[PDB]
Write a protein that binds this DNA or RNA. Structure first.
Ligand code: MG
Ligand code: MG
Ligand code: MG
Ligand code: MG
Ligand code: MG
Ligand code: MG
Ligand code: MG
Ligand code: MG
Ligand code: MG
Ligand code: MG
Ligand code: MG
Ligand code: MG
Ligand code: MG
Ligand code: MG
Ligand code: MG
Ligand code: MG
Ligand code: MG
Ligand code: MG
Ligand code: MG
Ligand code: MG
Ligand code: MG
Ligand code: MG
Ligand code: MG
Ligand code: MG
Ligand code: MG
Ligand code: MG
Ligand code: MG
Ligand code: MG
Ligand code: MG
Ligand code: MG
Ligand code: MG
Ligand code: MG
Ligand code: MG
Ligand code: MG
Ligand code: MG
Ligand code: MG
Ligand code: MG
Ligand code: MG
Ligand code: MG
Ligand code: MG
Ligand code: MG
Ligand code: MG
Ligand code: MG
Ligand code: MG
Ligand code: MG
Ligand code: MG
Ligand code: MG
Ligand code: MG
Ligand code: MG
Ligand code: MG
Ligand code: MG
Ligand code: MG
Ligand code: MG
Ligand code: MG
Ligand code: MG
Ligand code: MG
Ligand code: MG
Ligand code: MG
Ligand code: MG
Ligand code: MG
Ligand code: MG
Ligand code: MG
Ligand code: MG
Ligand code: MG
Ligand code: MG
Ligand code: MG
Ligand code: MG
Ligand code: MG
Ligand code: MG
Ligand code: MG
Ligand code: MG
Ligand code: MG
Ligand code: MG
Ligand code: MG
Ligand code: MG
Ligand code: MG
Ligand code: MG
Ligand code: MG
Ligand code: MG
Ligand code: MG
Ligand code: MG
Ligand code: MG
Ligand code: MG
Ligand code: MG
Ligand code: MG
Ligand code: MG
Ligand code: MG
Ligand code: MG
Ligand code: MG
Ligand code: MG
Ligand code: MG
Ligand code: MG
Ligand code: MG
Ligand code: MG
Ligand code: MG
Ligand code: MG
Ligand code: MG
Ligand code: MG
Ligand code: MG
Ligand code: MG
Ligand code: MG
Ligand code: MG
Ligand code: MG
Ligand code: MG
Ligand code: MG
Ligand code: MG
Ligand code: MG
Ligand code: MG
Ligand code: MG
Ligand code: MG
Ligand code: MG
Ligand code: MG
Ligand code: MG
Ligand code: MG
Ligand code: MG
Ligand code: MG
Ligand code: MG
Ligand code: MG
Ligand code: MG
Ligand code: MG
Ligand code: MG
Ligand code: MG
Ligand code: MG
Ligand code: MG
Ligand code: MG
Ligand code: MG
Ligand code: MG
Ligand code: MG
Ligand code: MG
Ligand code: MG
Ligand code: MG
Ligand code: MG
Ligand code: MG
Ligand code: MG
Ligand code: MG
Ligand code: MG
Ligand code: MG
Ligand code: MG
Ligand code: MG
Ligand code: MG
Ligand code: MG
Ligand code: MG
Ligand code: MG
Ligand code: MG
Ligand code: MG
Ligand code: MG
Ligand code: MG
Ligand code: MG
Ligand code: MG
Ligand code: MG
Ligand code: MG
Ligand code: MG
Ligand code: MG
Ligand code: MG
Ligand code: MG
Ligand code: MG
Ligand code: MG
Ligand code: MG
Ligand code: MG
Ligand code: MG
Ligand code: MG
Ligand code: MG
Ligand code: MG
Ligand code: MG
Ligand code: MG
Ligand code: MG
Ligand code: MG
Ligand code: MG
Ligand code: MG
Ligand code: MG
Ligand code: MG
Ligand code: MG
Ligand code: MG
Ligand code: MG
Ligand code: MG
Ligand code: MG
Ligand code: MG
Ligand code: MG
Ligand code: MG
Ligand code: MG
Ligand code: MG
Ligand code: MG
Ligand code: MG
Ligand code: MG
Ligand code: MG
Ligand code: MG
Ligand code: MG
Ligand code: MG
Ligand code: MG
Ligand code: MG
Ligand code: MG
Ligand code: MG
Ligand code: MG
Ligand code: MG
Ligand code: MG
Ligand code: MG
Ligand code: MG
Ligand code: MG
Ligand code: MG
Ligand code: MG
Ligand code: MG
Ligand code: MG
Ligand code: MG
Ligand code: MG
Ligand code: ZN
Lengths: 48, 112, 118, 116, 59
RNA sequence: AGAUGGUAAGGGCCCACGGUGGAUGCCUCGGCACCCGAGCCGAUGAAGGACGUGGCUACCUGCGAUAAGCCAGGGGG
RNA sequence: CGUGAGGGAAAGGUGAAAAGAACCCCGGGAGGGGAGUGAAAUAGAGCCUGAAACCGUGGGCUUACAAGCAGUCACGGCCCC
RNA sequence: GCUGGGGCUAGGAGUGAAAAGCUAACCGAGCCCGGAGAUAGCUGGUUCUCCCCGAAAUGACUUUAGGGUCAGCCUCAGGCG
RNA sequence: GUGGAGCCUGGGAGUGAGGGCGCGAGCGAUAACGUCCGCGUCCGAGCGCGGGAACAACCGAGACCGCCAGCUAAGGCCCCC
RNA sequence: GGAUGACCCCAGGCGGUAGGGGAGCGUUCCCGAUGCCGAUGAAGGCCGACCCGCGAGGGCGGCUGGAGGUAAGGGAAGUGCGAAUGCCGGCAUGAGUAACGAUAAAGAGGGUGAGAAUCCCUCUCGCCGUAAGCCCAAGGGUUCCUACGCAAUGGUCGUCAG
């Protein structure tokens, strides 16, 4: 039956994207934390 | 004088090969060859090659006579197991161990 | 219980088992000698023997009978013309099964050869 | 500083496991099972050390009794006779006498009858 | 059913006792009357192709 | 009539030798604590990256189409 | 692994020096046997040491009329020193 | 009526032809990180050896009754004799 | 009456679910391996030992270690024994 | 007794849970140590029926191992595991057992190759056909084509393959 992951790139980018993160005070902090931790990818990679 | 051959990391389960190895212990080289030839098991192929390779060393390297050779000793040890996943129902995963054998054959000369 | 029952099942249903026998007849009657598993071999005997014994009859009826199993007009033509006559004086036993010495590698199945007799 | 287990535990286990040689299955191979068996074996020995002293005396009494009845009297009579005679040779020796030196035992039986 | 399960680990001794029947019987072989090589009886000799005193098969 | 042995399909205990496995000891490029030193960077586009960059180059490092490097001063041999 | 915020491992050691095993043999290979290197190769790269569970081979004692927390005490038989 | 794509509404909040339904495979109050080593009068666990002594399961009070405070009973040191 | 007796000051506890049995009561049905007190005891902690076929608390008896020596307790002395 | 923990003699105590007290053993580290043991072999490992100690332990000897270890006397602690449905890893048992994923279905001949029920070719047989055929869009991201391969992946095999 229909499971929970139904990929959609526009949705993916418009949600967890870089610009989305930068727009909100909460999201900017995500990027701060991820950088501080040293994540290789601050934001979900998506092929546009 | 003895001659030996060891096939290590043979991808077959020790318990299975021993069944075949047991068939030729203490037999003349000629008798063993006869047995392995008509033994209906996968292991027979592997045990065969180690037997021949041991007989080869006997004639070549160790100054023994093919017409005197018998299987003085033979045994399988177990080598590192290959662990693989086997997906079961309701999300559970099992772990299959694809086992491994170190087959040894040691040949001696029956004087007379 | 299986008391006094004749004919193997060979793990095939009715139509498949029949097809198996027909196709093996076509194969045997075409090359004169085929290799199969010992059980299929033995069963093949009577199935073909009856076909051969009908080619010996020669009539149109016999041709139309044998054609139900064999289908191939060319083959049946070979059966009546080339095969059948060398069994004119022979009464049954037109085939033979001889068991081979080596088993199959992938499943250890015992093999044997079926052939038309000289 | 840090003092990790290191060598100590393996050594303690081997002591036990060596003491458990000869036992059946994991009792001689598994440390834990070896220990449980060794506890029982310590109590058994202590108990059987104490009871070995009984086990033999009962044998001695059976044997002395066997030789006595050959001479027409029973053990309970024989011992009393010996007491009245004032003979204090023990049962370990009486039994040895009863078998190795039968004529000597005969004489003791005599003095036993004479005493009453 | 309520999922039966072993109560105790099988001992090394009991495991091995169960396997007292698991031994293989060596193949039964007779000499070929033509080429003296060993082969299963009632089988066409895979070494020389002879059965019943005649050539039957290319080897 | 009486009696007492060799039997091992397999099993058990001990011994020897192996296999598996990676504990122990030794080691340390790394870590930890304290003290001292030092302490801002950015529209002259930071922090951090993407993609590139080698004769042959997957990755790391370095570098930016002048791309494992260009110029000059000092150091060194 | 998780849609995501986020979670989050395992994995160090040949040798003084690669001298990292030319060549020959069995094998399709893997592997092994000789040869050679080394003080050492059960230091051979699946590499220091290499414990235990666990698996096996060989040897000694033993077991198919026997009732068991498996030991313990006694005696005897057999094998060993 | 069903359905693709593009959107909006969320945690004491959303949404609900109403089942406390659903809000990323457990919703009478989602998930992650933090407070946080919350708190647990409860349960479990607590690692070498030898030597001497050796209890209690009672009383009183207790939002107390399988928890406590004092008393009783054990032990060690000094003193009294 | 010199005893792992007693008294005084102080350090450290643990216990504050007891249980069987005998005798004296209540409660119960002159019921319960029942319940609630009292005096004693043992088990608890002596599931160490002999007896009771077996059996924490009934009888015997308080196990520092050793002995292939002796005497007894309860209980026993036809055979198992 | 002798005078003091010097050893001897006589006597009595010595079941033990919660628990109090005492004496010790061992592990890591510091002083002792610019020392001492050490390739004529450190640690660690495997043995031992030997020696000392009530015991925890400590010696000695054999094999392994191949570069560290460390006394008398003192000091300081991440200091002793058998259990926590503990944690991490390794390996067992069940057991050569269930299973090997739609009951549309196979049979022979020829080819290749060290090896073939499973790869290629032919013929026969069966299954789908409002699909089990074809073309888009999502989504996946080189899986496309060819050459050379079969350790692992493929629930078997493999010369074949995403
Ligand atoms: Mg959708
Ligand atoms: Mg996707
Ligand atoms: Mg899109
Ligand atoms: Mg779209
Ligand atoms: Mg965005
Ligand atoms: Mg800001
Ligand atoms: Mg990066
Ligand atoms: Mg990541
Ligand atoms: Mg993000
Ligand atoms: Mg066979
Ligand atoms: Mg040869
Ligand atoms: Mg689940
Ligand atoms: Mg497994
Ligand atoms: Mg039927
Ligand atoms: Mg019939
Ligand atoms: Mg039929
Ligand atoms: Mg039938
Ligand atoms: Mg049949
Ligand atoms: Mg079929
Ligand atoms: Mg079938
Ligand atoms: Mg059909
Ligand atoms: Mg039909
Ligand atoms: Mg008929
Ligand atoms: Mg035949
Ligand atoms: Mg095959
Ligand atoms: Mg440790
Ligand atoms: Mg221990
Ligand atoms: Mg240890
Ligand atoms: Mg050790
Ligand atoms: Mg120790
Ligand atoms: Mg034993
Ligand atoms: Mg013994
Ligand atoms: Mg064992
Ligand atoms: Mg065993
Ligand atoms: Mg073991
Ligand atoms: Mg003990
Ligand atoms: Mg005793
Ligand atoms: Mg006793
Ligand atoms: Mg006595
Ligand atoms: Mg006594
Ligand atoms: Mg007795
Ligand atoms: Mg009398
Ligand atoms: Mg008397
Ligand atoms: Mg007397
Ligand atoms: Mg049912
Ligand atoms: Mg049921
Ligand atoms: Mg059932
Ligand atoms: Mg059912
Ligand atoms: Mg079941
Ligand atoms: Mg069970
Ligand atoms: Mg086992
Ligand atoms: Mg075994
Ligand atoms: Mg069994
Ligand atoms: Mg056969
Ligand atoms: Mg030939
Ligand atoms: Mg006999
Ligand atoms: Mg035996
Ligand atoms: Mg056998
Ligand atoms: Mg036994
Ligand atoms: Mg080993
Ligand atoms: Mg390893
Ligand atoms: Mg700075
Ligand atoms: Mg930058
Ligand atoms: Mg780069
Ligand atoms: Mg320059
Ligand atoms: Mg310069
Ligand atoms: Mg999730
Ligand atoms: Mg992901
Ligand atoms: Mg998390
Ligand atoms: Mg971890
Ligand atoms: Mg090195
Ligand atoms: Mg090095
Ligand atoms: Mg070659
Ligand atoms: Mg060759
Ligand atoms: Mg090939
Ligand atoms: Mg090679
Ligand atoms: Mg070889
Ligand atoms: Mg080599
Ligand atoms: Mg040399
Ligand atoms: Mg040397
Ligand atoms: Mg070695
Ligand atoms: Mg070495
Ligand atoms: Mg090694
Ligand atoms: Mg080293
Ligand atoms: Mg190893
Ligand atoms: Mg081992
Ligand atoms: Mg054996
Ligand atoms: Mg009987
Ligand atoms: Mg018997
Ligand atoms: Mg004995
Ligand atoms: Mg619409
Ligand atoms: Mg829509
Ligand atoms: Mg949408
Ligand atoms: Mg929508
Ligand atoms: Mg909303
Ligand atoms: Mg809304
Ligand atoms: Mg929100
Ligand atoms: Mg909430
Ligand atoms: Mg609301
Ligand atoms: Mg609705
Ligand atoms: Mg979620
Ligand atoms: Mg949810
Ligand atoms: Mg849900
Ligand atoms: Mg709530
Ligand atoms: Mg707080
Ligand atoms: Mg927390
Ligand atoms: Mg603790
Ligand atoms: Mg006491
Ligand atoms: Mg009051
Ligand atoms: Mg009060
Ligand atoms: Mg209450
Ligand atoms: Mg109550
Ligand atoms: Mg409470
Ligand atoms: Mg108090
Ligand atoms: Mg008092
Ligand atoms: Mg005092
Ligand atoms: Mg007292
Ligand atoms: Mg007192
Ligand atoms: Mg006090
Ligand atoms: Mg205290
Ligand atoms: Mg204290
Ligand atoms: Mg309390
Ligand atoms: Mg209370
Ligand atoms: Mg109370
Ligand atoms: Mg109560
Ligand atoms: Mg009460
Ligand atoms: Mg009375
Ligand atoms: Mg009463
Ligand atoms: Mg009353
Ligand atoms: Mg009444
Ligand atoms: Mg009561
Ligand atoms: Mg009563
Ligand atoms: Mg009453
Ligand atoms: Mg009472
Ligand atoms: Mg208690
Ligand atoms: Mg008692
Ligand atoms: Mg008492
Ligand atoms: Mg009794
Ligand atoms: Mg009793
Ligand atoms: Mg009795
Ligand atoms: Mg008893
Ligand atoms: Mg009792
Ligand atoms: Mg009772
Ligand atoms: Mg007496
Ligand atoms: Mg009496
Ligand atoms: Mg009686
Ligand atoms: Mg009487
Ligand atoms: Mg009886
Ligand atoms: Mg008697
Ligand atoms: Mg004394
Ligand atoms: Mg006492
Ligand atoms: Mg005591
Ligand atoms: Mg208590
Ligand atoms: Mg003290
Ligand atoms: Mg220690
Ligand atoms: Mg200490
Ligand atoms: Mg120093
Ligand atoms: Mg030094
Ligand atoms: Mg020196
Ligand atoms: Mg040297
Ligand atoms: Mg040495
Ligand atoms: Mg050390
Ligand atoms: Mg020692
Ligand atoms: Mg050495
Ligand atoms: Mg050593
Ligand atoms: Mg050094
Ligand atoms: Mg040391
Ligand atoms: Mg030191
Ligand atoms: Mg010291
Ligand atoms: Mg000092
Ligand atoms: Mg410290
Ligand atoms: Mg600790
Ligand atoms: Mg414990
Ligand atoms: Mg569990
Ligand atoms: Mg469990
Ligand atoms: Mg359980
Ligand atoms: Mg665990
Ligand atoms: Mg554990
Ligand atoms: Mg585990
Ligand atoms: Mg498993
Ligand atoms: Mg079963
Ligand atoms: Mg079955
Ligand atoms: Mg099956
Ligand atoms: Mg299935
Ligand atoms: Mg199927
Ligand atoms: Mg069906
Ligand atoms: Mg073919
Ligand atoms: Mg073919
Ligand atoms: Mg194939
Ligand atoms: Mg093949
Ligand atoms: Mg149509
Ligand atoms: Mg696309
Ligand atoms: Mg994918
Ligand atoms: Mg790829
Ligand atoms: Mg294409
Ligand atoms: Mg491709
Ligand atoms: Mg190709
Ligand atoms: Mg492959
Ligand atoms: Mg393969
Ligand atoms: Mg292969
Ligand atoms: Mg695979
Ligand atoms: Mg495969
Ligand atoms: Mg699969
Ligand atoms: Mg392709
Ligand atoms: Zn032949």
């Amino acid at each position: 039956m229909k499971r929970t992951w139904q990929p959609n790139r526009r949705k993916r980018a418009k949600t967890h994207g870089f610009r989305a993160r930068m727009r909100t005070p909460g999201g900017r902090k995500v990027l701060k934390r991820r950088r501080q931790k040293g994540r290789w990818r601050l934001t979900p990679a998506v092929r546009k | 004088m003895e001659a030996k051959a060891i096939a290590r990391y043979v991808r077959i389960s020790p318990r299975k090969v021993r069944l075949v190895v047991d068939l030729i212990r203490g037999k003349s080289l000629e008798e063993a060859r006869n047995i392995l030839r008509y033994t209906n098991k996968r292991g027979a192929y592997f045990v065969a090659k180690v037997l021949e390779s041991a007989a080869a060393n006997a004639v070549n390297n160790h100054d023994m006579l093919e017409d005197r050779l018998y299987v003085k000793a033979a045994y399988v040890d177990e080598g590192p197991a290959l662990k693989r996943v086997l997906p079961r129902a309701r999300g559970r995963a099992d772990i299959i161990k694809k086992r491994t054998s170190h087959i040894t054959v040691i040949l001696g000369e029956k004087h007379g | 219980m299986r008391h006094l029952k004749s004919g193997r099942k060979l793990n095939r249903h009715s139509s498949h088992r029949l097809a198996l026998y027909r196709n093996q007849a076509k194969s045997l009657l075409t090359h004169g000698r085929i290799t199969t598993t010992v059980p299929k071999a033995k069963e093949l005997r009577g199935f073909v023997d009856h076909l051969i014994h009908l080619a010996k009859r020669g009539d149109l009826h016999a041709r139309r009978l044998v054609l139900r199993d064999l289908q191939d007009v060319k083959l049946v033509r070979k059966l009546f013309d080339e095969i059948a006559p060398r069994y004119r004086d022979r009464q049954g036993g037109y085939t033979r099964v001889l068991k081979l010495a080596e088993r199959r590698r992938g499943d250890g199945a015992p093999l044997a050869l079926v052939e038309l007799v000289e | 500083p840090r003092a990790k287990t290191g060598v100590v535990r393996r050594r303690k286990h081997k002591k036990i496991l060596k003491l458990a040689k000869g036992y059946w299955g994991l009792r001689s191979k598994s440390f834990r099972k070896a220990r449980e068996t060794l506890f029982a074996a310590g109590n058994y020995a202590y108990a059987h050390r104490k009871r070995r002293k009984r086990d033999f005396r009962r044998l001695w009494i059976v044997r002395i009794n066997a030789a006595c009845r050959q001479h027409g009297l029973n053990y309970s009579t024989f011992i009393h006779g010996l007491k009245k005679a004032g003979i204090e040779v023990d049962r370990k020796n009486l039994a040895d006498l009863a078998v190795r030196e039968p004529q000597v035992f005969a004489e003791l039986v005599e003095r036993a009858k004479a005493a009453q | 059913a309520k999922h039966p399960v072993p109560k105790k680990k099988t001992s090394k001794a009991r495991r091995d006792a169960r396997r007292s029947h698991h031994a293989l019987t060596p193949p039964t072989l007779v000499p070929c009357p033509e080429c003296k090589a060993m082969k299963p009886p009632h089988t066409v000799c895979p070494e020389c192709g002879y059965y019943a005193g005649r050539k039957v098969l290319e080897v």
